[PDB]
Design a protein around this motif. Sequence first.
Motif, short mmCIF file in Angstrom:
data_model
loop_
_atom_site.label_atom_id
_atom_site.label_comp_id
_atom_site.label_asym_id
_atom_site.label_seq_id
_atom_site.Cartn_x
_atom_site.Cartn_y
_atom_site.Cartn_z
N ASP A 86 -20.79 -5.56 -2.11
CA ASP A 86 -20.26 -6.82 -1.31
C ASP A 86 -21.54 -7.70 -1.23
N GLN A 87 -22.82 -7.15 -1.06
CA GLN A 87 -24.05 -8.10 -1.08
C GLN A 87 -24.14 -8.72 -2.27
N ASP A 88 -24.01 -8.24 -3.40
CA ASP A 88 -24.20 -8.89 -4.76
C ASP A 88 -23.25 -10.01 -5.02
N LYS A 89 -21.89 -9.86 -4.64
CA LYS A 89 -21.04 -10.61 -4.65
C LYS A 89 -21.31 -12.21 -3.88
N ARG A 90 -21.86 -11.79 -2.31
CA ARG A 90 -22.27 -12.90 -1.56
C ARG A 90 -23.44 -13.76 -2.17
N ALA A 91 -24.37 -13.07 -2.78
CA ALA A 91 -25.34 -13.70 -3.61
C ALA A 91 -24.91 -14.56 -4.75
N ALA A 92 -23.95 -14.42 -5.76
CA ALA A 92 -23.49 -15.04 -6.57
C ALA A 92 -22.70 -16.17 -6.17
N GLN A 93 -21.76 -15.94 -5.11
CA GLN A 93 -21.19 -17.05 -4.57
C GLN A 93 -21.85 -17.94 -3.65
N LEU A 94 -22.96 -17.64 -3.24
CA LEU A 94 -23.66 -18.53 -2.38
C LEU A 94 -24.83 -19.51 -3.31
N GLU A 95 -25.68 -18.87 -4.14
CA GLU A 95 -26.40 -19.25 -4.86
C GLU A 95 -25.69 -20.57 -5.83
N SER A 96 -24.18 -20.71 -6.18
CA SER A 96 -23.58 -21.58 -6.78
C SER A 96 -23.60 -23.08 -5.84
N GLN A 97 -23.93 -22.97 -4.62
CA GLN A 97 -23.85 -24.24 -3.94
C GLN A 97 -25.36 -24.65 -3.41
N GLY A 98 -26.33 -24.18 -4.02
CA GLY A 98 -27.69 -24.26 -3.69
C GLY A 98 -28.40 -23.70 -2.72
N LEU A 99 -27.50 -22.57 -2.05
CA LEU A 99 -27.99 -21.83 -0.74
C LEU A 99 -28.78 -20.50 -1.51
N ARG A 100 -29.66 -19.96 -0.54
CA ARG A 100 -30.34 -18.91 -0.91
C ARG A 100 -29.86 -17.51 0.14
N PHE A 101 -30.09 -16.51 -0.43
CA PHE A 101 -29.21 -15.09 0.15
C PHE A 101 -30.38 -14.12 0.33
N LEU A 102 -30.30 -13.31 1.22
CA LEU A 102 -31.12 -12.07 1.19
C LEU A 102 -30.49 -11.06 1.98
N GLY A 103 -30.51 -9.98 1.33
CA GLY A 103 -29.68 -8.67 2.01
C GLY A 103 -30.68 -7.65 2.33
N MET A 104 -30.65 -7.22 3.90
CA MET A 104 -31.69 -6.51 4.54
C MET A 104 -30.58 -5.74 5.63
N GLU A 117 -21.14 -25.48 5.82
CA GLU A 117 -21.05 -26.68 6.27
C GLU A 117 -22.15 -27.43 6.82
N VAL A 118 -23.24 -26.56 7.25
CA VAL A 118 -24.13 -26.79 8.19
C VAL A 118 -25.70 -26.62 7.62
N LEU A 119 -25.74 -25.96 6.43
CA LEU A 119 -27.00 -25.81 5.96
C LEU A 119 -27.30 -26.52 4.61
N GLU A 120 -28.34 -26.85 4.18
CA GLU A 120 -28.51 -27.48 3.05
C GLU A 120 -29.29 -26.82 1.66
N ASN A 121 -29.77 -27.40 0.67
CA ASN A 121 -30.23 -26.73 -0.36
C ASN A 121 -31.79 -26.07 0.05
N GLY A 122 -31.96 -24.64 -0.36
CA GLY A 122 -33.13 -24.22 -0.35
C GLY A 122 -33.16 -23.25 1.04
N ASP A 123 -32.27 -23.64 1.89
CA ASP A 123 -32.24 -22.72 3.09
C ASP A 123 -31.68 -21.30 2.79
N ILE A 124 -32.09 -20.68 3.82
CA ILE A 124 -32.11 -19.10 3.72
C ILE A 124 -31.24 -18.36 4.71
N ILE A 125 -30.18 -17.88 4.13
CA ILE A 125 -29.34 -16.88 5.21
C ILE A 125 -29.61 -15.54 4.92
N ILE A 126 -29.74 -14.70 6.25
CA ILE A 126 -29.92 -13.41 6.14
C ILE A 126 -28.81 -12.55 6.98
N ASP A 127 -28.29 -11.78 6.16
CA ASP A 127 -27.32 -10.86 6.67
C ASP A 127 -27.94 -9.54 6.91
#
Lengths: 478, 478
Positions: A109-127, A91-101
Amino acid sequence: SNDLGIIGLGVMGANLALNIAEKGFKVAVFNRTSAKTASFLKEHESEKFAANLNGYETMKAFAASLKKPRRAFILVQAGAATDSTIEQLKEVLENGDIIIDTGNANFKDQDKRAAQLESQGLRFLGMGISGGEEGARKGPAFFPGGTPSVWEEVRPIVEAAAAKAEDGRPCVTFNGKGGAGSCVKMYHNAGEYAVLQIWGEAYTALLAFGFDNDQIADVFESWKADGFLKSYMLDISIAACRAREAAGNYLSEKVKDRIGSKGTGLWSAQEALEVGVPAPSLSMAVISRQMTMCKEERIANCKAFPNFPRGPSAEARDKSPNSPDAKQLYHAVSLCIIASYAQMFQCLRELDKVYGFGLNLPATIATFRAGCILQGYLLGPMTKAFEENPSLPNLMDAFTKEIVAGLDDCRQILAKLTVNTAVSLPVMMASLSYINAMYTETLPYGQLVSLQRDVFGRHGYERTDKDGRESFEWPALQ
Amino acid sequence: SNDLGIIGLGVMGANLALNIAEKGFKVAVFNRTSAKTASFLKEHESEKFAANLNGYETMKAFAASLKKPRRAFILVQAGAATDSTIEQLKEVLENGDIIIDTGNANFKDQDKRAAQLESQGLRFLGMGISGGEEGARKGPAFFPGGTPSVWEEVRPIVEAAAAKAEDGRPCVTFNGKGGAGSCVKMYHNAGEYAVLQIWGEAYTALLAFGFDNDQIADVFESWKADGFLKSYMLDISIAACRAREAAGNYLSEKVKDRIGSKGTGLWSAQEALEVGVPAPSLSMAVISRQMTMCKEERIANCKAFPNFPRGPSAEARDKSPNSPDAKQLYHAVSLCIIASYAQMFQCLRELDKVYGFGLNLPATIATFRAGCILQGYLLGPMTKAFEENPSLPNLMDAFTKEIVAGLDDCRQILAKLTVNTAVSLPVMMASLSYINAMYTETLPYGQLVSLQRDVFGRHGYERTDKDGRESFEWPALQ
Ligand SMILES: NC(=O)C1=CN([C@@H]2O[C@H](COP(=O)(O)OP(=O)(O)OC[C@H]3O[C@@H](n4cnc5c(N)ncnc54)[C@H](OP(=O)(O)O)[C@@H]3O)[C@@H](O)[C@H]2O)C=CC1
């Protein structure tokens, strides 16, 4: 306005904020309990830095202070807490913003988060992050995996705070698509699980010879001077032996023999079993921890049967590090780390084929050199081994000379430990069985059990002379 | 019109129809390949009960010929095949009809399948059958679990076709709600997995002494006459060893040492790891099968390393069953089944707590006495052991005298095998580690590793003298 955001002021989260702020980046911190955020700025105000460290009590202010595109780092407990935090940020990020777990999560579970987050214009990275409290404060090793575009965007920030190897390269390397980074991190801990147990098992063996805590680390210190086993795990093993309470007693005597575990060791063992890669040492490390957790069962078992045959106690007359018992274990210990690391690498190569990360194996071994838990001398030959022969059938094939030198010396002392003492040696004996099985052309139990299944299940068996499956007709036995 | 339906005309499916037809019940059979269904009636038309065997080519005719409420038994490959059959049945049955899955499936899915079928007025039951081809026709053991109401409708059919024990009880007992029945079957195979490997491992041990294929089963036959190890799995081990081709060569020489696996062994090891029950023998049995499947790895390893130190070969001059090596191996083998069976029941009890099966353990052991793979004498005391003490901490506590008699004798022979030969002994040596670990009040490696985690991760540790968790302040090591 700040440049980066870190969520979760835990052991890893707190120190990482200090690292990047010391690097000159403006670090914004947030924790679920705002009291920790206020205390964090309170104690770390006398540093030559922390003018870049501003803590926030509300999430809306935490996000609004980040440079666009936003880079938020998550350092909370893996599982529910990570899932809770990510949905809160939506609710506080915008399109193109990066979240890093960065928590030690499951790569599935890392791949599941990527699919659920890219559907709302968000970007994900797993490290994944390794190094512990001290590694977090000085410099850790990073294991990133996911969409390649996101990694380059956060590359300058990660490399600055990353551990610096001996040659000078930062101890970070892109691993592949999907949960490649967390998969490497998951099996990074799997290697840690076994070797940590190997040191503890050798600790039991020395104690079984009447070695009090002081001479046990004296034996360990000599092995470090050999250079082959020089590793961070050796340092902490020596430190554990030397630990002494204020009363003068050794700390190891008062410690309850229950080992906690959080996910990563367990998950890697299940996946290695699932994919079909034989990793007895990796699985036995998890099981050994499970045995220590059933303390109430052990107490009841001993009470219900106190006349346990523990064997003839065989104290070692020579308790010096030069003692033959100490010398035999050095070859026994070293080959078990070699065996355990082989299984850890064997699963990773097969995991690359199944999930298609596109893993750069020789560089991933080189990223372990400094800052991570597995750091040590042995990573040199292991990185070199897979660099010369990326198609190496087994990691032990690079260490032939060490195997010939002490495989026999390893065999008797474990047998000596077995016959003379009742000390459990789960991981070490699993590694020896792995070495023998992987280096015997034909295992007789493989032939017989194949016949056994055909007797009742009529499942058939494979033949050496010709392809196909054949089933011999058996007489009635019921 | 028939009263019951069997789907899946495989090795197990065909013989089960013969069993129920002999009992007098009208059996309706269906197979995916109708050629198998047409062929099935042809050879079994000269039987005294082929009026009860009616084959159908369409599922609609298969369902319409079943007595209401319909009871269809599914005996197809677990997984996709069962899912295809379940969805196919959803269009041909009506409210109140019962579906029974008998394939070796996962107990997690069994409760999920029941929920999906109750939403369309259908009833589901999860049951497992063991005994193989011969056991299926002359009466297998059944492990049903699910909705208690469903069980009563299928009670007459299951108990009639079940194996008859020595006293006379049918080898069937309700296990609990959900996938309790298949959960017992999943760990029924887990116990089968270990002992089958134990027999194969003892075959390797004797072969390493120059006993040759023929004299090995002669040693096995002596143990059968002893009565302690008398079991169906022992009987098939002798039969597998005694198998000889017409050319005079042993059958075991031409069999490729690659062991296939189908679900149950792997799933049980993962679940035992997940719940936290230590079952190294169960996990090592799956791992041992994985080692035999890596034929290309061993062949490449042997070529890349032909100078393998195999140890000093120690042939036994006495190859009779009275030889000390054979006598010691008998005690070494026997306690490992005792260890392995304990973990199988230890997992089952903990699985009951987690999923709330409501498992009737003493009766669940009592269904194993006849008709299943693990049938034998040893199941007698185990049923009695849990009847006297349902809160028994560990099955090893019931076998005190047998443990005292040969625990030391087990230790020496394994040490002799280790020092003299390089034959892998994964399951048997894993059990020995289980025996030692479960009977020591304090495990030193549990203490030391607890400190190791605190050094880098600051995870803390438990103390024996006082309750709580403590974190010792460590010096810098990086
Ligand atoms: N491991 C053990 O100790 C024991 C195993 N079991 C279990 O019982 C079950 C049946 O065993 P078994 O008799 O050997 O038969 P199989 O497991 O070999 O399966 C054969 C049957 O399944 C049918 N079927 C197979 N594949 C499919 C598919 N994709 N889609 C739809 N239908 C399919 C086959 O049809 P078709 O042939 O016409 O193509 C045939 O009817 C198994 O799950 C087994 O695990 C039972 C007792 C002991």
